[PDB]
Symmetry: D2
Subunit: 143 residues, 4 copies
Amino acid sequence: APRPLREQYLHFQPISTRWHDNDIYGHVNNVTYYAFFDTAVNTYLIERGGLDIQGGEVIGLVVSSSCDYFAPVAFPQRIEMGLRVARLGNSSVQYELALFLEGQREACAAGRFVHVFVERRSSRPVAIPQELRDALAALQSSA
Amino acid sequence: APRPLREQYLHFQPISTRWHDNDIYGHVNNVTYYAFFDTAVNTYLIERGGLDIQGGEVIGLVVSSSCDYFAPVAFPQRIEMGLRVARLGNSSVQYELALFLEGQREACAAGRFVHVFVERRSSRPVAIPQELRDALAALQSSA
Amino acid sequence: HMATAPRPLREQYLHFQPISTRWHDNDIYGHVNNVTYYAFFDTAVNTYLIERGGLDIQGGEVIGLVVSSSCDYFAPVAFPQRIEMGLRVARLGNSSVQYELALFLEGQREACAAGRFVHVFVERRSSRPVAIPQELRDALAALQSS
Amino acid sequence: HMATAPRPLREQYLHFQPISTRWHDNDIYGHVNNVTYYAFFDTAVNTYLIERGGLDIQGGEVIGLVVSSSCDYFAPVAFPQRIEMGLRVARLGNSSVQYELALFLEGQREACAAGRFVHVFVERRSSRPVAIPQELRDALAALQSS
Ligand SMILES: [Cl-]
Ligand SMILES: [Cl-]
């Protein structure tokens, strides 16, 4: 089975839920979890890896992603992303994430996604800059 | 001129920003401010006024809204909604809100919106339930 | 029922644009969320600016920034209903413009929601207001109610 | 370039659906954000379930819940480009179904992104898995690659 626990992740981010996260069936819509993934990863890249989204030469593009869902959460509930790095490559990295509900031990959902690092003007993949590598390595998972 | 200050509002909510709040021009998109409005109002209605979004008999529908924007914010910046109630009617209420950037005194943006309270099944407007009125009145603005 | 402002009519608008509705346009109460309407406003205007004004959002030097907006809601709509935005230009200044929009059921004549927004155009890198470029102004001028 | 998985072809899909792009589909890097693709998946499937399966999202007793999904991205697209979702059903169980989708430029044949999701159908009030209702199953069956 699962399920994922908080101590299996390296870094955490609270994310506040918004009215419109819920859909017609009353819980956070599956699409929104990936917004959560994307937000946790890039928040980390900016505060700890020197990512410059406004004018930086090198950017992370999502080449792929996925998620399994174990139990719903709903606005206005309080949640938290665990983030870890499964592998750091030469020009890409695979993240693993998990959504946690405040007060619950087991993850509501767990997924992965993959960045490739490219030159912003051309979109040629490029070796990950060093400052970013240092930050990404600091997230290395245990398994 | 403006601009709005924090002490002119009754209740506050931090809202975390998400990767995708920024648009192609790099700042939080104007549309998202109203998601912020909607989130601050309904969060308050649920924790302090007994709003039951899942199964409640009475709901708030937005009959109108607006916003003026004074200066941009951007993900991953940290922000905060001030909320106040300009007037409580028999079956509607006008809220005033303002977006604040952490560390800035003056509001980035300020807007209003109007709820009408209806019966969920029929959508007949109905007098605001008492528990909700108590909470809404506790937000009354000074001017 | 909802906003008590008088409902605008299809004829009061110049230019129309279908927008396809999306699963999550509906919120928990089951109709399109009020915020999404503003996304419809942005999309209609900008689609118009790119196909008729020559707006270059990727590398253009002059951009349009939103300084205010508002909307009144008259009757709900829901995914997967088919909808259509009405657009016109109410006022055309040297560096700013006010748009008026209304959402229709593509099968219908009464507006379901209507509002307004203001663009100010600015040099992209600095954000100093510049005058509206002629190509865009020519496209805006074709939407001024005669 | 991006995902290195082999790109799916337009012919491998059964059913198509235009989706209009929106201003804020583009993120700060200027192309449609990866998350939005999944919104396109949800919309295509559900549009299909309502018009061909009789899904009643407002008051129906059986609903479809998403238990997993994934997507590979091959080439970016951008508002205001015109796009089209390809849909087919890969597997049809008693209470679950796996969909496969791909996004195309409506003018084009190579997929720009492709992925998958799984619906489990459940009694709406409880969320106990129920079998898929016959009307929906008949619509799902028409998408199984022959
Ligand atoms: Cl805009
Ligand atoms: Cl769904």
